[PDB]
């Protein structure tokens, strides 16, 4: 079983890169993170940003989750991400991804020791 924090660096990272690299980024990423095996993961925001930014904003601004819960962290700078979203024509097995680059603050839930990110809230 996948430990939270290995499945948001698998779902959430993509540091290689500054920024969604074309239309087709998204389908391209989706793909190779395994998020479309069994089924479509209908939205998936990445950051391009290294870990260690990533993982720092767990110690930056805390916010209210969006269920209420107050592990929630704002970065205090914007980051680099994309966010990947079915389109209409998308249909399992054959995803199809609109890649939207943008530059916002994330805001990622965290918990353990070391207290790092385990979900991806949203992005400001």
């Known amino acids: 079983k996948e430990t939270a924090a290995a499945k ?7 540091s290689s890169t500054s920024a969604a690299s ?7 990423m989706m793909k190779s993170r ?12 990445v950051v391009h940003e290294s ?24 970065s205090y700078s914007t980051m680099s991400i994309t966010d990947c979203r079915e389109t209409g024509s998308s249909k399992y097995p054959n995803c199809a991804y609109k890649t939207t680059q943008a530059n916002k603050h994330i805001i990622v839930a965290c918990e353990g020791n070391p207290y790092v990110p385990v979900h991806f809230d949203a992005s400001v």
């Open 8 to 14: 948001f660096e698998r779902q959430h990272m993509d």
């Open 22 to 28: 074309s239309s087709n980024y998204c389908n391209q």
């Open 34 to 45: 395994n998020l479309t095996k069994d089924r479509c993961k209908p939205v998936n925001t």
């Open 51 to 74: 870990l260690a930014d990533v993982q720092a904003v767990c110690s930056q601004k805390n916010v209210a989750c969006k269920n209420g819960q107050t592990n929630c962290y704002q």
